[PDB]
Design a protein around this ligand. Sequence first.
Ligand SMILES: Nc1nnc2ccccn12
Lengths: 156, 39
Amino acid sequence: GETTDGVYRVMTRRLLGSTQVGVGVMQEGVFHTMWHVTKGAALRSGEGRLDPYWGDVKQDLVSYCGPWKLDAAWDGLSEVQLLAVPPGERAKNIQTLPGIFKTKDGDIGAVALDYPAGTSGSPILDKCGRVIGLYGNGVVIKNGSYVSAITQGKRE
Amino acid sequence: DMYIERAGDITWEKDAEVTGNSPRLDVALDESGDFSLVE
Ligand SMILES: Nc1nnc2ccccn12
């Protein structure tokens, strides 16, 4: 299968036609996505198979072929870019200044951008092109708008 | 049966479209990985 670093769509043929259920990041030979996109199922890349290696429902993250590799963090000050990969549409960069999710266990960056559910797992990047987290686990606020956490894993 | 397809490189685009606001929200995260608003 294709192992080149980059952003990938996660598709299924179980439903009508070919449906995009999410997105992920290939980096250092490991595939990174959100848990709710694959529910921990194995994936296919051409004729090759990617088996889950680590996952956690609460963090809503999963890695395939190896441990979570992404460790960059939002600096708390700068604008970032969502590299949105919407279903049936070309990858597109959207720049934004993150807001904050304040929790009893600390603050997390959050991006107020509304994309289809199938865009979950799209990477959020800093100005160096490093992935600071994945888009797709968040909340619907008063006005009906979607705000995603910037969800990042731990590199062991 | 799920499969992946390459969609692009991961790079910062100079002069990309700039949008979105920056809300500061109080939230809670449950054991199922669901975020909710704290009011
Ligand atoms: N726009 C929107 N509403 N709910 C969700 C969930 C995941 C990703 C995007 N979403």
